[PDB]
Amino acid sequence: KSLWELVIEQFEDLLVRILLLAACISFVLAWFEEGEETITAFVEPFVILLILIANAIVGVWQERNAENAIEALKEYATEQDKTPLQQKLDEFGEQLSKVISLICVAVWLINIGHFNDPVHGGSWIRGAIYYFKIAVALAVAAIPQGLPAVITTCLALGTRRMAKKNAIVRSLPSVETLGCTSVICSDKTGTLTTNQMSVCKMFIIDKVDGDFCSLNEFSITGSTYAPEGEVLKNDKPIRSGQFDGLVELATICALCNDSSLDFNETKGVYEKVGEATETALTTLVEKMNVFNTEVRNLSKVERANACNSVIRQLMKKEFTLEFSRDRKSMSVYCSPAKSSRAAVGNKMFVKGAPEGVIDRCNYVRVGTTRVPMTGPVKEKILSVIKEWGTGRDTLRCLALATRDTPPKREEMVLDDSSRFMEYETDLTFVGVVGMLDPPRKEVMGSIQLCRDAGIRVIMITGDNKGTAIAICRRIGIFGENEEVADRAYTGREFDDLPLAEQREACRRACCFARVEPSHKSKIVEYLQSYDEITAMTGDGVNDAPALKKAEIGIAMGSGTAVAKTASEMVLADDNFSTIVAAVEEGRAIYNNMKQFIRYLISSNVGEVVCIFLTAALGLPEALIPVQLLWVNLVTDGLPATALGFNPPDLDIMDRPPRSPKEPLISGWLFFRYMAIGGYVGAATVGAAAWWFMYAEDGPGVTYHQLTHFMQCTEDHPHFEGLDCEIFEAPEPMTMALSVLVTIEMCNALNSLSENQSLMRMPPWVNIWLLGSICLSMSLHFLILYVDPLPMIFKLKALDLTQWLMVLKISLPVIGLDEILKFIARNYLEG
Numbered sequence: 084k085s086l087w088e089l090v091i092e093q094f095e096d097l098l099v100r101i102l103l104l105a106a107c108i109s110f111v112l113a114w115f116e117e118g119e120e121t122i123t124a125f126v127e128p129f130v131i132l133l134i135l136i137a138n139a140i141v142g143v144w145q146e147r148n149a150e151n152a153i154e155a156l157k158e159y160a161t162e163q164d165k166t167p168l169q170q171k172l173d174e175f176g177e178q179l180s181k182v183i184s185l186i187c188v189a190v191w192l193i194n195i196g197h198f199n200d201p202v203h204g205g206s207w208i209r210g211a212i213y214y215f216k217i218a219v220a221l222a223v224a225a226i227p228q229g230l231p232a233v234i235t236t237c238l239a240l241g242t243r244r245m246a247k248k249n250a251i252v253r254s255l256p257s258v259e260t261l262g263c264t265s266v267i268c269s270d271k272t273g274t275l276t277t278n279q280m281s282v283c284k285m286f287i288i289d290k291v292d293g294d295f296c297s298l299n300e301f302s303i304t305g306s307t308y309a310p311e312g313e314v315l316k317n318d319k320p321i322r323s324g325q326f327d328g329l330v331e332l333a334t335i336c337a338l339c340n341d342s343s344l345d346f347n348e349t350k351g352v353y354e355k356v357g358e359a360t361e362t363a364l365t366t367l368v369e370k371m372n373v374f375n376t377e378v379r380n381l382s383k384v385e386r387a388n389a390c391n392s393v394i395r396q397l398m399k400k401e402f403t404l405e406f407s408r409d410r411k412s413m414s415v416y417c418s419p420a421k422s423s424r425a426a427v428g429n430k431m432f433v434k435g436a437p438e439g440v441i442d443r444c445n446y447v448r449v450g451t452t453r454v455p456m457t458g459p460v461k462e463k464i465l466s467v468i469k470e471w472g473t474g475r476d477t478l479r480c481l482a483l484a485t486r487d488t489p490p491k492r493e494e495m496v497l498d499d500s501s502r503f504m505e506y507e508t509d510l511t512f513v514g515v516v517g518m519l520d521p522p523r524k525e526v527m528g529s530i531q532l533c534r535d536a537g538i539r540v541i542m543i544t545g546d547n548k549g550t551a552i553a554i555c556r557r558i559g560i561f562g563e564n565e566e567v568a569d570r571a572y573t574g575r576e577f578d579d580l581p582l583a584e585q586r587e588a589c590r591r592a593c594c595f596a597r598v599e600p601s602h603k604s605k606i607v608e609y610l611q612s613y614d615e616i617t618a619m620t621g622d623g624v625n626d627a628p629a630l631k632k633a634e635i636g637i638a639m640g641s642g643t644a645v646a647k648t649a650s651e652m653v654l655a656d657d658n659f660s661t662i663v664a665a666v667e668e669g670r671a672i673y674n675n676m677k678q679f680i681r682y683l684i685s686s687n688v689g690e691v692v693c694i695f696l697t698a699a700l701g702l703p704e705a706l707i708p709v710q711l712l713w714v715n716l717v718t719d720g721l722p723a724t725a726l727g728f729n730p731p732d733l734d735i736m737d738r739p740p741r742s743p744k745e746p747l748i749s750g751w752l753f754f755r756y757m758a759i760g761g762y763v764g765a766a767t768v769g770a771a772a773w774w775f776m777y778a779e780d781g782p783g784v785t786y787h788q789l790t791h792f793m794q795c796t797e798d799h800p801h802f803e804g805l806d807c808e809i810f811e812a813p814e815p816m817t818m819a820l821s822v823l824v825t826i827e828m829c830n831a832l833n834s835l836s837e838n839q840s841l842m843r844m845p846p847w848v849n850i851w852l853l854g855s856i857c858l859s860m861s862l863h864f865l866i867l868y869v870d871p872l873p874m875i876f877k878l879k880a881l882d883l884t885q886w887l888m889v890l891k892i893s894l895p896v897i898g899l900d901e902i903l904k905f906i907a908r909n910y911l912e913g
């Protein structure tokens with residue numbers, strides 16, 4: 084059950100029922116009076132009922148549009164769980180219910196002296212019932228009904244829109260927190276950058292003298308997974324079969340990888356089989372072709388695996404050593420089979436992260452030579468390792484080596500992967516392949532959007548800290564000259580920090596490189612310590628316990644279904660930009676709720692000001708009960724509902740993330756409610772008071788007469804030349820009514836955005852609201868001009884002259900908010 088539904092939606096229904104009851108009591112009592120057997124006696128109950136029918140029709144169509152949105156999305160627990168927002172809306176509704184109740188009792192109490200008035204027949208009871216019908220009808224009107232159905236729509240409206248932007252939400256209460264997101268922690272590879280990495284640069288050993296180590300760098304072209312491209316040396320097109328060093332490197336590439344290149348004929352472009360990393364080497368082999376096999380004549384469907392198949396028989400893989408996270412490399416054992424190359428012994432190819440394959444290296448091959456890995460051969464090639472991955476391109480270096488004297492196959496463990504590393508201690512060295520994946524377009528811009536939004540991004544990659552930082556500088560996470568030695572840590576560094584110092588690091592960090600699986604859950608632990616709403620991404624099962632600890636666990640479309648199920652939202656895009664585009668939508672929905680609430684509260688305040696003002700001033704009452712019901716049906720109805728179709732605001736990603744601690748209504752916003760409320764409630768009684776004092780063929784009276792109108796029968800000398808029954812005239816009541824309905828249709832236009840002016844976001848930015856306004860307006864004109872109708876609601880037709888007065892009075896309500904929305908943008912926001 085819902086506390087808001089119980090105290091507002093249901094309470095409003097009982098009020099209508101007891102209102103109708105009050106009507107039918109007046110019906111029975113209007114029999115014992117004389118001349119009251121007229122055919123007007125049934126009219127009032129017949130209207131309160133007839134309006135209740137239309138108010139119900141609105142309810143049905145408002146519920147039918149809500150259940151459809153939820154179902155259209157779905158198509159294509161000991162009762163103790165509620166969102167902080169749901170706890171606030173239920174606290175709100177309880178206050179509104181209580182406040183309106185006191186307010187309406189006060190309406191009935193301030194009219195005690197008006198009970199025995201001659202207008203009621205001179206009976207105290209007959210008047211005491213009337214003002215009861217007033218207070219109750221006001222209570223029905225004042226109540227902001229329809230909230231849950233409008234939210235339910237918006238909640239599913241954005242969800243359909245998020246799915247359009249590849250953002251697939253697991254749960255619905257999740258999207259509320261998406262807008263409150265403070266920190267977005269995301270994996271670099273696959274998300275912040277596409278998985279289309281190819282080998283663009285590569286270098287090997289050229290000439291070696293003590294402290295004179297020379298390198299032979301190469302630059303390959305064609306960063307697509309295709310043999311399209313030629314290897315270049317010093318910007319000079321040279322065949323790969325011109326250097327003996329490329330021979331050894333190409334050999335390891337095609338033998339250590341388990342990646343194929345199935346050219347899909349229907350695609351037209353070469354595709355990828357296996358892993359993205361290893362696939363690049365396969366494309367590298369074809370683009371090099373040191374064997375100088377016939378290339379062009381081989382068809383598109385086989386060329387990709389052509390030069391790759393030349394080595395499939397040159398040697399043959401015996402067994403392949405698996406990858407281990409500790410060693411950070413992998414190896415194959417290849418005794419030359421079917422090639423008569425077994426006479427020249429057998430070798431062992433390895434492939435992995437530089438440092439591991441260099442520290443555990445003792446020899447450096449020079450084309451077809453062997454040299455003991457000394458000092459200069461190490462530091463003067465690892466300088467290139469650094470300057471490659473730290474430059475403009477930010478390459479992912481991958482050292483390639485070979486073991487000329489491998490341990491016997493008669494001695495090898497397989498159940499223990501930690502032993503694998505010990506089989507790779509002594510080996511030669513060939514070269515290193517520079518490899519890059521490109522960051523997605525405008526991630527740098529999507530990073531920017533977060534910064535403006537006050538949302539912090541934290542990168543979690545597997546690169547070294549040097550290139551990890553270089554990546555952040557490329558995508559604007561870090562400044563090009565900012566000292567980031569305080570905002571970037573590694574697995575070894577973060578663990579070497581004091582426990583209390585570690586959480587302090589998470590208050591400033593934006594990058595993490597070479598990270599243990601346990602750190603992700605350990606970072607969320609620290610981010611939650613600073614009370615930050617954390618959106619964490621993941622792909623592996625190592626991320627699984629972290630996607631439950633984080634506020635918004637974010638999975639991957641290409642990721643395993645284990646994380647996709649145990650998350651709150653899944654990226655079918657595998658894009659980082661999808662994360663923030665879904666954050667934006669989370670904010671857009673909450674704003675749409677605040678526009679809905681603002682319109683109702685502000686307007687309905689005036690409706691309460693209206694009744695209280697005329698009573699406190701001494702003016703003839705502006706509204707009878709059945710008119711108050713018409714105000715509600717027309718303003719609290721379709722126009723307010725269509726407010727849930729407002730477009731996303733403009734100042735949406737510039738304001739800081741909304742805290743769950745923030746009250747539902749701020750101080751300024753409450754004042755803003757009262758101000759607009761204050762005006763419409765005064766502008767409506769000033770409309771009726773205008774008919775009296777200043778209107779043409781509206782009996783011009785002094786303000787003093789109008790205030791003391793009850794003495795008209797007595798004060799003949801003070802009310803000379805006037806008719807006492809003119810204070811019961813329908814024209815002023817029509818002016819008050821027409822203004823109130825118009826000024827609320829104008830106030831609806833104020834709720835297309837919270838702070839953006841109507842100049843920035845025009846009234847036609849929401850067509851559904853325009854139609855709603857048109858409908859309510861035409862419906863009001865129907866009551867005024869279709870002859871049986873004005874008699875019923877005690878109204879008279881308005882001519883063009885006094886319809887313009889309605890405009891002159893109403894339209895400034897747009898003017899007032901524009902004054903306030905100006906102050907909000909320029910004196911509060913920024």
Ligand SMILES: CCCCCCCC/C=C\CCCCCCCC(=O)OC[C@H](COP(=O)(O)OCC[N+](C)(C)C)OC(=O)CCCCCCC/C=C\CCCCCCCC
Nearest residue numbers: 840842843890891894895896897898899901902905908909
């Ligand atoms: C016959 C009956 C009258 C009917 C009235 C209908 C109201 C019409 C609604 C809108 C008309 C706006 C046209 C004005 C042209 C300005 C263009 C526009 O684009 O405007 C943008 C600017 C502010 O924008 P900014 O933030 O970018 O510049 C701030 C940035 N910086 C500080 C660097 C400059 O102008 C703003 O929007 C300010 C807009 C305020 C204009 C209305 C104010 C008139 C005064 C009173 C009317 C209501 C009184 C009720 C009670 C009042 C009590 C106080």
Ligand SMILES: [Ca+2]
Nearest residue numbers: 223224226719
């Ligand atoms: Ca209402």
Ligand SMILES: [Ca+2]
Nearest residue numbers: 686687718719
């Ligand atoms: Ca209203």
Ligand SMILES: [K+]
Nearest residue numbers: 630631633636
């Ligand atoms: K979670």
